[PDB]
Amino acid sequence: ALTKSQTDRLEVLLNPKDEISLNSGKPFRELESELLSRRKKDLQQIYAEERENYLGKLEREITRFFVDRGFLEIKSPILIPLEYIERMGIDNDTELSKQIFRVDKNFCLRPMLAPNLYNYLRKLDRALPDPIKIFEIGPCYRKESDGKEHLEEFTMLGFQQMGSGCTRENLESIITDFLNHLGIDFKIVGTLDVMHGDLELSSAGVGPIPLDREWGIDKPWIGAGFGLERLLKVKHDFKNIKRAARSESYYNGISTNL
Amino acid sequence: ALTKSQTDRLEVLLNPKDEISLNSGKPFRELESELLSRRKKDLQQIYAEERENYLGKLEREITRFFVDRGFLEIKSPILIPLEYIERMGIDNDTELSKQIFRVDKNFCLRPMLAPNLYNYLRKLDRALPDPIKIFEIGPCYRKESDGKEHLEEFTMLGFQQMGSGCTRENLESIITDFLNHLGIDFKIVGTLDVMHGDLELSSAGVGPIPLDREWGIDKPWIGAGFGLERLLKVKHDFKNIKRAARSESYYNGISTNL
Numbered sequence: 059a060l061t062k063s064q065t066d067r068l069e070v071l072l073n074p075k076d077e078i079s080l081n082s083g084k085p086f087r088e089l090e091s092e093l094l095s096r097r098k099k100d101l102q103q104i105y106a107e108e109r110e111n112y113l114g115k116l117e118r119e120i121t122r123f124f125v126d127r128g129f130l131e132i133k134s135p136i137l138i139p140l141e142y143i144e145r146m147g148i149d150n151d152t153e154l155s156k157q158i159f160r161v162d163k164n165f166c167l168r169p170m171l172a173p174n175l176y177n178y179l180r181k182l183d184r185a186l187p188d189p190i191k192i193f194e195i196g197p198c199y200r201k202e203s204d205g206k207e208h209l210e211e212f213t214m215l216g217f218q219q220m221g222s223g224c225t226r227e228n229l230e231s232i233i234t235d236f237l238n239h240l241g242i243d244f245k246i247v248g249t250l251d252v253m254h255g256d257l258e259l260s261s262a263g264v265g266p267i268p269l270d271r272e273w274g275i276d277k278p279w280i281g282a283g284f285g286l287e288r289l290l291k292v293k294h295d296f297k298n299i300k301r302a303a304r305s306e307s308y309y310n311g312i313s314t315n316l
Numbered sequence: 317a318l319t320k321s322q323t324d325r326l327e328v329l330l331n332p333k334d335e336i337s338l339n340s341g342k343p344f345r346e347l348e349s350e351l352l353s354r355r356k357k358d359l360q361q362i363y364a365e366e367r368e369n370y371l372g373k374l375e376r377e378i379t380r381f382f383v384d385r386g387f388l389e390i391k392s393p394i395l396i397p398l399e400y401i402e403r404m405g406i407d408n409d410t411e412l413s414k415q416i417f418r419v420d421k422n423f424c425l426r427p428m429l430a431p432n433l434y435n436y437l438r439k440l441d442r443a444l445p446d447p448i449k450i451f452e453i454g455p456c457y458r459k460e461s462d463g464k465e466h467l468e469e470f471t472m473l474g475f476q477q478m479g480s481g482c483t484r485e486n487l488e489s490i491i492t493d494f495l496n497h498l499g500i501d502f503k504i505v506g507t508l509d510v511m512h513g514d515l516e517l518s519s520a521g522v523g524p525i526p527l528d529r530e531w532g533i534d535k536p537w538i539g540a541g542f543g544l545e546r547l548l549k550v551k552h553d554f555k556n557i558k559r560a561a562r563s564e565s566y567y568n569g570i571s572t573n574l
């Protein structure tokens with residue numbers, strides 16, 4: 059009989075498509091040696107042929123999608139003024155209020171892209187023709203209870219369109235084309251949320267809303283935010299989102315502790 | 317005569333290749349209106365035709381280079397254990413000691429890639445054939461005095477090879493092919509530093525060194541780290557590195573305050 063510790067160890071080495079039944083009579087040392095050999099060969103194959111990181115490759119694929127659909131690629135600060143959080147309407151009695159990683163006195167690691175996107179929409183409206191279409195992909199940070207769907211350090215896609223054409227129908231069409239392009243099953247639940255079963259892939263919004271005024275925004279808009287690691291978790295059928303994270307423990311979902 | 321404040325404003329709107337002499341008799345309001353029109357059209361052109369962010373595009377170009385030369389693409393945590401800094405030999409009497417952005421009690425924003433790359437070299441040596449070739453591109457953070465060559469939030473390329481072939485000659489060849497591929501003039505000064513005039517583009521190293529033992533490393537290695545914003549600063553002839561940063565004030569080196 060395998061111990062709980064022994065099966066924890068074998069699960070770390072098990073990949074979702076592996077056709078190995080641990081429940082078999084063979085001893086731990088044999089099962090472990092078999093999985094070690096498979097995971098080493100998986101890494102050798104990546105090293106020999108493709109060599110691209112899941113998270114980076116997904117970011118490049120998403121970037122190509124939105125650039126081709128006419129969205130401007132934004133790269134804005136990750137370390138943002140703490141005042142952006144309050145101006146987002148976030149204070150006591152909101153969950154996000156307590157999830158913020160603070161740096162020094164006046165700064166924090168961004169938990170969301172909306173502040174910087176708001177600022178870019180306002181400034182670019184003075185230069186660019188209607189409608190204004192932008193997106194950003196990059197790190198975001200939230201303090202979280204241990205979860206199989208939550209990382210404290212994750213990667214967010216955010217996209218926003220401002221001006222004409224900002225209808226719910228057009229928003230659902232962007233989401234639908236995007237996730238069909240990636241090959242990720244979903245349902246849109248209606249603000250609106252893009253779900254994979256019980257897992258939230260995205261929350262999306264249709265403006266205007268009263269908050270827009272604080273940011274100097276006075277036009278209709280549509281937008282959404284997606285976690286890339288949740289997308290990888292669904293696409294690759296990982297049982298825990300840690301396999302998709304920036305990590306020293308997993309490479310493209312393969313254990314690095316061999 | 318233009319005030320210092322007025323010329324500060326016009327310089328924000330001036331692009332390096334602009335053939336406009338501010339020294340001309342025309343009044344501030346006219347010069348400003350002329351530059352505003354040029355910068356707006358520069359942004360319209362980006363929005364119409366390419367739409368890619370300088371920093372992201374450079375990252376993708378560098379990624380393609382190293383992947384094609386056989387380096388594995390790494391994406392590891394940006395928020396790292398504070399213990400990695402001490403184990404790097406960094407304490408009082410080192411500059412970097414005081415430059416660290418600390419988060420909570422046991423963590424910090426990484427100021428360097430060497431800790432995570434060291435850990436990846438050690439773990440991948442159990443799976444991959446010799447030599448082991450990896451690279452990473454991503455955010456790094458250092459507290460800095462105001463500088464025209466320094467950002468507090470920047471982007472670092474790090475690459476490292478471990479095992480056979482780790483000679484100084486092979487290291488200089490990687491650097492030389494890389495910067496000739498990007499079109500960036502340089503000189504190698506000899507550890508070794510890759511300089512553009514007085515601007516340091518890279519510091520590079522040849523192991524083994526005694527520090528390797530703390531990280532479980534016992535093979536020869538070569539590697540280097542490059543700041544992407546310094547590369548963009550040289551390539552685009554920006555007078556201040558802020559034009560290349562993650563920013564809300566500049567898009568591809570064009571002022572967003574129009």
Ligand SMILES: Nc1ncnc2c1ncn2[C@@H]1O[C@H](COP(=O)(O)OP(=O)(O)NP(=O)(O)O)[C@@H](O)[C@H]1O
Binds near residue numbers: 200260285
């Ligand atoms: N801690 C996290 N780890 C991974 N992805 C996250 C995390 N927090 C948010 N996301 C993703 O980022 C998207 C935009 O943020 P948001 O809509 O605020 O998520 P959320 O409301 O916190 N969903 P949830 O925390 O699961 O109840 C979400 O739809 C998720 O896909």
Ligand SMILES: Nc1ncnc2c1ncn2[C@@H]1O[C@H](COP(=O)(O)OP(=O)(O)NP(=O)(O)O)[C@@H](O)[C@H]1O
Binds near residue numbers: 545
């Ligand atoms: N604050 C910064 N802003 C932008 N790039 C940086 C910064 N700090 C380091 N870099 C880049 O990262 C590379 C690797 O880090 P490192 O060799 O430690 O730089 P460095 O020794 O601090 N050079 P310098 O700070 O200018 O005296 C450097 O060669 C720079 O190109």
Ligand SMILES: N[C@@H](Cc1cccc(C(F)(F)F)c1)C(=O)O
Binds near residue numbers: 216280
């Ligand atoms: N509220 C989260 C997710 C989100 C939701 C809807 C619209 C956007 C955005 F992309 F338009 F910003 C983002 C965030 O701000 O990142």
Ligand SMILES: N[C@@H](Cc1cccc(C(F)(F)F)c1)C(=O)O
Binds near residue numbers: 428474475476521540
């Ligand atoms: N000392 C810095 C830069 C550096 C220098 C030489 C080698 C590397 C590396 F890529 F091999 F890590 C990195 C850092 O650690 O990022």
Ligand SMILES: [Mg+2]
Binds near residue numbers: 200
């Ligand atoms: Mg949450």
Ligand SMILES: [Mg+2]
Binds near residue numbers: 258260261
């Ligand atoms: Mg949500």
Ligand SMILES: [Mg+2]
Binds near residue numbers: 458
């Ligand atoms: Mg320095």
Ligand SMILES: [Mg+2]
Binds near residue numbers: 516518
């Ligand atoms: Mg140096």
